[PDB]
Amino acid sequence: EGYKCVXKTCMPA
Amino acid sequence: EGYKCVXKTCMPA
Amino acid sequence: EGYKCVXKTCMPA
Amino acid sequence: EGYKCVXKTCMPA
Amino acid sequence: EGYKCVXKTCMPA
Amino acid sequence: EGYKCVXKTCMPA
Numbered sequence: 386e387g388y389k390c391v392x393k394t395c396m397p398a
Numbered sequence: 399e400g401y402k403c404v405x406k407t408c409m410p411a
Numbered sequence: 412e413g414y415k416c417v418x419k420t421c422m423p424a
Numbered sequence: 425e426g427y428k429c430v431x432k433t434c435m436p437a
Numbered sequence: 438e439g440y441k442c443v444x445k446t447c448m449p450a
Numbered sequence: 451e452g453y454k455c456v457x458k459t460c461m462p463a
């Protein structure tokens with residue numbers, strides 16, 4: 386999976 | 399499956 | 412079921 | 425491997 | 438840089 | 451003493 390982020394916020398891709 | 403994070407702080411998604 | 416972490420400092424959630 | 429980012433947004437390359 | 442661990446508990450190095 | 455890490459790469463400390 387890894388992550389997706391906008392600025393400082395990251396959640397599972 | 400995975401974490402939610404804000405900068406360095408991560409908790410279960 | 413998961414951790415809560417600041418960087419790699421983690422404890423059970 | 426790693427991340428592509430444009431402006432504030434990053435996701436898996 | 439990086440983190441020092443004993444077992445699963447880690448602090449900034 | 452235990453182990454030390456940078457990223458995914460770690461070793462004794």
Ligand SMILES: OCCCOCCOCCOCCOCCOCCOCCOCCOCCOCCOCCOCCOCCOCCOCCOCCO
Pocket residue numbers: 388390392393395401403405406407408414416418419421427429434442444445446447455457458460
């Ligand atoms: O493994 C060794 C053995 C360990 O043993 C004992 C410990 O065990 C304990 C249980 O383990 C569970 C570990 O904790 C779960 C943590 O979640 C996974 C973290 O994965 C990524 C690793 O690199 C990052 C380190 O920063 C962490 C921040 O998280 C962000 C989520 O990742 C996205 C990438 O973050 C890089 C961020 O950007 C660039 C850098 O600037 C920060 C700004 O972020 C902006 C975003 O942009 C993205 C662009 O890169």
